[PDB]
Design a protein around this ligand. Sequence first.
Ligand SMILES: [Pr+3]
Ligand SMILES: [Zn+2]
Ligand SMILES: [Zn+2]
Ligand SMILES: [Zn+2]
Ligand SMILES: [Zn+2]
Ligand SMILES: [Zn+2]
Length: 168
Amino acid sequence: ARTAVCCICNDGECQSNVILFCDMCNLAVHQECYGVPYIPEGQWLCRRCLQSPSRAVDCALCPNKGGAFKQTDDGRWAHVVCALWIPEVCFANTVFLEPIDSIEHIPPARWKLTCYICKQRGSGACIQCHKANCYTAFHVTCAQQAGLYMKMEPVRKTAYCDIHTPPG
Ligand SMILES: [Pr+3]
Ligand SMILES: [Zn+2]
Ligand SMILES: [Zn+2]
Ligand SMILES: [Zn+2]
Ligand SMILES: [Zn+2]
Ligand SMILES: [Zn+2]
């Protein structure tokens, strides 16, 4: 395996929890952000390149492409980071961080919000600014690519619009 920031947490701090590179698509992920408890001595492939090596995939939860995908339990693909941040979604196995399931428990309202970053409605499940009584909505990956503050912390997962970026 080959051991640039982890595209799930956007942190470059490598260490016991290394950043792996897919030997086919050059995806870079922490073994703990993507669910890789054992690293192979030879080539490592992400789940997308194991299954759909010559075809990119769509996220079931956002309109954006690229980054780190797992299969869902219902015939789709989703971003790890989208599954992490949407409250009703989860991972069936929390060590392997797969499959992504419970997408059917997302309230229809999330698909009716308008992402204020890409301005699209109905193309993914939005989350909202964690600020009380701020209703600004965004896709998880749109918040990531736009550089909004997004923190997971022992586990609370708080994301903020640019008005409400918290002290730090
Ligand atoms: Pr299920
Ligand atoms: Zn990471
Ligand atoms: Zn790959
Ligand atoms: Zn996504
Ligand atoms: Zn968006
Ligand atoms: Zn806000």
